[PDB]
Amino acid sequence: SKDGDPQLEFKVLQGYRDLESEMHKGRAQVTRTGDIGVAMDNLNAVDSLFNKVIGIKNNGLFAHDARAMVSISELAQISVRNLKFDDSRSMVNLENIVNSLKRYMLKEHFKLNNIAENRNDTSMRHSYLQQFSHYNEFSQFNWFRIGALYNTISKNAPITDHLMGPLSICFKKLSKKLGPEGSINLFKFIIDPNSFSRSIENLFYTSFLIKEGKLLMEHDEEGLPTIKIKQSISHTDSRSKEIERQRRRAAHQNHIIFQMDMPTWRKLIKKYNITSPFLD
Template sequence: MTKRHHEGPEHSSLSKSHKKKRINSFPDLSNNPDNNEFNILQGYRTIDNDVDKQKVDSTRNADINIAVTKLNDIDSLFNKTVGIQANRNSLLAYDSRAMLNVSELAQISIRSLKLNESKKLLNCDDVVNSMKKWMLEEYLKDNNIEVEDDDSEDLSDHEQNHEEDYTQDQFDEASGGNNDTKKITQREKKRTALAKYESFTDFFHFNWYKLGCLYKQVSLKPNLVEHMLGPLDVERKKRVYTAKTKSDVSNSKSTTAEKITNETLNDSVSTTTPEQVKLCFKILKQKMGYKSINLFKFIIDPESFSNSVENMFYISFLIKDGRLVMETDPDDGFPTIRLIDRLPKDSHARETEIQRRIEMPLNHIIFQLDIPTWEKLIKYFDIKTAFIRR
């Protein structure tokens, strides 16, 4: 038993020395450039993960210190990349993405408008009480009213001695790492001093002239000599009472509504568009047959510009439906229209022609006809009467 008791520690010391030797046998990676690049990339990944988690916290707490801290971490990582001689494109890409995430985090925090030293939203009561203090200066001075105002920048001896008892670690922990305890304490003292002005509520005690001058100076509005609306002279109108007249029904003539029948209804209704299209086709077929005619000679009415436009509108339906063909006159280059050729009697040729007409491409043409052009066309073609008479 004694021999085993001595062999145990000896064996343990050998094993410890052996492990120490194995540990020291590994190379030192602290000065390796590749290892530094890996650590920087790992730092950027850690920042991205933390920012994603803290976006929700910033929405609830609205603390800009989180974004400021992460921005400082990114700056420290970027400074480490300066000494790396290898390709830095991957590091710069991670840095850009981290800056984008921190910018989004800062945007979420800035929406709360944290303006004071405690990184919280300004209190509306503090603003109102500060305005009261400023507007009550003349009133308090004239009436010899003293308001205890202890919003000095220096802390009292008791508070200073109390702060000296804190160690540096406790001070950093209480201020959130930013050493803002002194500023927060001063802000609370100012808020307590401003709260004493809440009791002043009389409208005439405040110097509104000072506030008006301040608004005039800040708003930069132009000075006016007189009111822009001018004097208003409003006279009250007297109500005039008129006597009601009785209607004499006995001497008046009785009138009844005119009875409407189918014949009178048909006579009063104007001709519809399909009927006008059929009329144009019928007139062209009767007068020209399958011969072509100048488009303008067919549609222009020398006595009515509106009828000329309507005729062109009706002809467009006939061309679209494949009833008419519009071509170009080889002699003068003006457009002409004619009835489409008849289908051949042979069944095979008839089907071939029908298929060719179906597959024929459609071209859209826009005619612009105004009164000066209408008058020039009447003189050029010497049109005396309308081809289409209604």
């Protein structure tokens, strides 16, 4: 758009990226030099860019710029104390302990974040205490080093563990008897005379058991429920059989619509001749 020309937003974004890049280093300068002048100039650097794009509502640069404000604020807060409160004495004091035990630097900066801590920045030594307020987290320091220092010179006490000593002192059986080398339909076990709330056990259960996929029987000449049995892999593991189980989708599918409470049950009983429940 002509108003809020995208060139302005692009240039200010470049400027703020440069500001973030220079802050990433100037954190060290502020912590080392003992003053905060760099961040004080960064204030003007932020303000110029902020004012140069007022009156526009492209908002993607605000979150990152808030980082500059937080960084400058925290650096100022910690630097107010660190400018020598006793202008001549470099004490061995409370903050000395906490900052010193956290100074170890050999890996977690030298070889972790692609950075190097400069060596050159008794009274003057007070200015090297401020390089250890960035952690903001637990796992980024060498706790292994401090732990190892103990038990070596301090504890001077035995440490190990002793030997292991204390350790040293229904239709499934019907199908089985039917056999895979034959073909008997489902109607032989649903024709208990007028057990109208028991016949539907098998029709709705054994309708198209042909789906198993050992062999692909042609389209049924009748289409009504049917059942047949074959022997297949009997492996116990579940994961290893997924490929074989999914293989059996190869069977073709043809769908006729007939699904009702069958046209009369008399034509069913008179092709498999039983009248008592052989099932359980």
